[PDB]
Amino acid sequence: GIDHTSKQHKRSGHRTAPKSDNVYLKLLVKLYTFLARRTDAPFNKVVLKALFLSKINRPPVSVSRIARALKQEGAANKTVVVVGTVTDDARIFEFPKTTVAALRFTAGARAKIVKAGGECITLDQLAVRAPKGQNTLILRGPRNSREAVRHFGMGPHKGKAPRILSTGRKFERARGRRRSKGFKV
Amino acid sequence: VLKKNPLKNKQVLLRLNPYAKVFAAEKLGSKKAEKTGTKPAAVFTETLKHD
Amino acid sequence: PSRFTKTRKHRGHVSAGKGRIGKHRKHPGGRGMAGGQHHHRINMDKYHPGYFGKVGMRYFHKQQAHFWKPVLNLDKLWTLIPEDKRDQYLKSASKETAPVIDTLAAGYGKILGKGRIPNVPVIVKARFVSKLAEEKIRAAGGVVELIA
Amino acid sequence: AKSKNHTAHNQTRKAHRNGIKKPKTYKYPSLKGVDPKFRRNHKHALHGTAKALA
Amino acid sequence: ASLPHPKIVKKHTKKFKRHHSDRYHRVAENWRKQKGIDSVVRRRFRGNISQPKIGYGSNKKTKFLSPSGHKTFLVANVKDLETLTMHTKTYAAEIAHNISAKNRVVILARAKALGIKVTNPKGRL
Amino acid sequence: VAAERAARKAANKEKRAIILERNAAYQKEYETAERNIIQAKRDAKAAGSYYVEAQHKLVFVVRIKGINKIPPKPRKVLQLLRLTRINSGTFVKVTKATLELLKLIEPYVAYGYPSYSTIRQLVYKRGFGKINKQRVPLSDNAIIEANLGKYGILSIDDLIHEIITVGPHFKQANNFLWPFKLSNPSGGWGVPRKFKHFIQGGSFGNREEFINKLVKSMN
Amino acid sequence: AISKNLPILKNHFRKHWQERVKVHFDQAGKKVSRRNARATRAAKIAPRP
Amino acid sequence: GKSHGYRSRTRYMFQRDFRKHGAVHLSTYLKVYKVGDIVDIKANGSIQKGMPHKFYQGKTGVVYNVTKSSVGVIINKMVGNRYLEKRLNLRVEHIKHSKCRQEFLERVKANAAKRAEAKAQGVAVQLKRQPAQPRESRIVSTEGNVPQTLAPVPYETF
RNA sequence: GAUGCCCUGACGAGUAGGCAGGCGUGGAGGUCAGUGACGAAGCCUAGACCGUAAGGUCGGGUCGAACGGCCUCUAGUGCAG
RNA sequence: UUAGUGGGCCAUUUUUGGUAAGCAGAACUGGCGAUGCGGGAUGAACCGAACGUAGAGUUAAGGUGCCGGAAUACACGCUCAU
RNA sequence: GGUUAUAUGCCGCCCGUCUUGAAACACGGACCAAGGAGUCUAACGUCUAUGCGAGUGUUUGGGUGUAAAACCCAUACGCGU
């Protein structure tokens, strides 16, 4: 016998591979597993872990978010890398030049980047240009902006959204939501 | 692949501890202490034997 | 498909995953929303506050078309010019040949003011406008023409 | 028929499985319950310090 | 004529027979685990049948080898043989139960030419 | 590639020379300390005084009870001393902070004051390092130098020196040793019933210098 | 029958609803018929639109 | 039936000390609390206003708010398997500065001196406290102190 | 065969229950130009082999017209009560 | 995010009702329930000790006349019971 | 050496079930075959995969067809912005 301080046979609880059966994503993972092992660059370890993430943990990155990032001081000529999809945003007018590396470009995003003189590249083309992540800038989309997150942690006084199909005057605005009808929240 | 005990395997003893060759040669496990002629005080003995 | 369900993995385990003690009986707790003010009060108060009781005034025979007024922010707005013609109009910022943007034709009923437009005059036809949307269009040298 | 009424037997064991977590501290706690007169001024003070490091 | 292997150890030769397959005709011998609340087999009281468990697994070096040292490979025709042309030390061919007597003579002749061991050469003879 | 073997053989030779001189020094240090305690006891006797020896600085602790039916407080203390299995043992630096721990776990442990002989035999026979969360046998001086080199400690005999003198890097040396895994004692425990105090003719609690006979039979 | 944090639902199946389920398996058939009837009508009425 | 009012079970807890009834001495009112100060809560039963609930008796916390007559204190209360933060509004008669902190600060100061003194003098100083150590060796003389022999005594009745 | 190969260390009780990897059955798409009246399927067999096991395979007897392996799809898919 | 559960019971110590109970009711811990294994002849809970499959060694608790593996061991006394 | 039957030593209560507690003087079970119990649907929550992305959804319908398939599509409408 052994007085176990921890739980035995506990899996790490991190993905160690994409759950996806996309062949081409599996090739990207074969590449970045190689570079992460054989270089010392922190970048490659990060990009490798990002290729494992589920769709909800790879939120899209608009081109306005890329544009905002290149306004950072000393950042205008960095390769922006998005381990995921770059979407268009018609809320910006002037987009800078720049090279963006990503898994996917929407048709509109690829148009807007190219029209400004830029270049959209795959993550394997990034590997050859920047094997040690040289001169890159990793961007992540916003995670906590999903509709589902509005509803997490629902409870008295917590200020979260109820799970509700129909909204209006008659749907969950009475006893419990105002002092005049029993009490508020 | 196989833990050898220094305390049995003489080769492994020497690997871990180069002084073991010296220690054995000079027989430091059986060192004679130098004779001294110290005697306890009366008081020490008188209390030792006291009823 | 049936071959991936846990029904298949419970084959041989007596209770089908429902317990020896408690069991899978018919409707312990009552059917549907039974008991919302009695034995299900805690759930209802925690996750559906506001569920019981009335607020506000009735409206008999409400027709939703009366309330049709879809909103467009200025943020967008230039989206309503087609992408071919957009780039020329932005570089040729002219009080003499400003683009007309019929926001009703596009299927909108009110221009709201979120965000920033280019400093390029535009004629905006709309049913309604916010106060700030109008200020921003005029500050770019535009006008709001009201229509019906 | 009659049953057991109450016991805390087994409750500390249950409590210690996922441990008794100390409540987690931040630089900058909420100014919540702090005197409103103080808070109202403090806004005005912080405003001026921004307009000064500029 | 096999690849040299370690002495093949079987940790448990005895078949795992279902509890009470000896007592009732209705209960077949095919292993089933007792799930019952009071079962002496489930609970592992001294004196009762042992249950299959992963500790009895065979050494990976010798798992699947027959006593000859070859792994068996079911063959139905000459083209199925001849997958084993270059693997004679590893694999032995077993002719499938449904091959006709006339087609067994063909498969066996070709087996001899290629030096493939056949595990069941006396079948249908 | 001869010069790679040459330079490695050179540097190795140099490392063994250093180990040789240190081990010779420790030998002297131990013997002088031993004889100075003996002469101090004689000199006091001669003067009609009593030499009161320094209080012990190091205990060795063995867990003597299994892992069922231990109350929460001693169960936590036992985990803090890395004693999570019957017959596992560790060294403990004595202080008020550690003495009050040993009080709490007295019914579950045997402990006392280890000699150099006992420490030498434990580390040579049953010494394993904690390297990268793994239990690795101390089969070469290189293994020790790689992990304790930053604190001096280049060899198994330096590691022993740090333990027995309760050196300034005791903590780090002592934590590096994986808890010793002893057998049951080879001629038994010497008593019909273990689970009473040594003083009452059981096995548990502080048995001072008699820990050495016990542990030598367990190792 | 209330539990967890789920939407309140409004599934109206408290009548004998299985007596009146209409599955539109004839979708493809009704399209062929409608087309034949356009063709037949076109012939009867020709050359009119 | 059972009874669990706000002051249930306080009979002894809120009693005044013996011969220490009556008016609160003035030093209680001249103490100055500042946000971040660590205070110990101990209800004065003579001041019924601003009084802590009996659970907080003997608990220490941090001042988070200062008002006319009172301070806000934060306490961590264990509820179930976790600690919730509680915010109490106590009149100052029920509070006192914790001397735990007062005597820690004296050590921070003393350490600063020692460290400065060590650099200028140009050596190296130990600033961690140590647990009480095993005694070192020592010679005890018997000069005017010859050991006196004791024996166990027989049983007597009284 | 990179879902591969390999090195190192630790660990292994379990009802209710959870999840995982597998075995088996009727039928469907694909494939093996698969097996078969020179004997398919079924059944019997203190004969043999493989698998921790679900199970798989082979020989012998009986028999007479169909049936299997693998990659997938699908369910009226596994019994001691 | 979701399962099961929401009849408990026992031992040491603290403890209430009761003449008491293998009774009723609380406190802290350890257990049984959910658990085999060595010991207590036997036994849910006691003692020891918690369990992948094997080999060797050593032990725990309990034992060593015979049943029964192991001294009809050694030592000082006490005890003869119709 | 395997298997099998037997002998010998030691060990081994009857499963399933409800239960704090079953070998129970608790319940079901004489035996065997075959059948025999978490399904489908409407609307949903979390999570995951996939497509496209400020959009998205061809299948009400129309066009076409090797004809319930496959292929193509306007206007709306839904959800989202």
Ligand SMILES: [K+]
């Ligand atoms: K183990």
Ligand SMILES: [K+]
């Ligand atoms: K379940």
Ligand SMILES: [K+]
């Ligand atoms: K009742």
Ligand SMILES: [K+]
């Ligand atoms: K009750």
Ligand SMILES: [K+]
């Ligand atoms: K087929």
Ligand SMILES: [K+]
């Ligand atoms: K629950």
Ligand SMILES: [K+]
């Ligand atoms: K519940």
Ligand SMILES: [K+]
């Ligand atoms: K037990």
Ligand SMILES: [K+]
């Ligand atoms: K027993």
Ligand SMILES: [K+]
């Ligand atoms: K023991």
Ligand SMILES: [K+]
């Ligand atoms: K007998």
Ligand SMILES: [K+]
């Ligand atoms: K035999």
Ligand SMILES: [K+]
């Ligand atoms: K029952």
Ligand SMILES: [K+]
């Ligand atoms: K009955």
Ligand SMILES: [Mg+2]
């Ligand atoms: Mg189960």
Ligand SMILES: [Mg+2]
């Ligand atoms: Mg049931």
